[PDB]
Amino acid sequence: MPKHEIANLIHYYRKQSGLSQQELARLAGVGKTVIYDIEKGKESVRLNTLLKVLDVLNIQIKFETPFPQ
């Protein structure tokens, strides 16, 4: 996956939601430093942490699979 796909994904939909990164962190119940790191392109974020951020922004994850058709 592109290195800044999720970075811009979180930033765009957070700015479009009017949330600061402190408000998005408080809503997701995660650390403030996590929002900074994600939007900077860092991918060492734990997934249960990332999903708590995505749900506040109403973004869900689909896995496209090689089979079946």
Helix (H) or strand (E) holding 52: helix 47-56
The binder of 8, among Cl ion, a copy of itself, none, by C-beta within 5 to 8 A per type, is Cl ion
Identify the burial level of 38 via C-beta atoms within 10 angstroms of its C-beta, where 0-12 means exposed, 13-18 middle and 19 or more buried. Answer: buried
Q: Give CA–CA dist 24/68, Å, rounded.
A: 37
The binder of 69, among a copy of itself, Cl ion, none, by C-beta within 5 to 8 A per type, is none
Decide: is 11 part of the binding site for a copy of itself (CB under 8 A).
Answer: no
Q: Which is nearer to Cl ion, 60 or 69 (CB)?
A: 60
Q: Which is nearer to a copy of itself, 26 or 46 (CB)?
A: 46
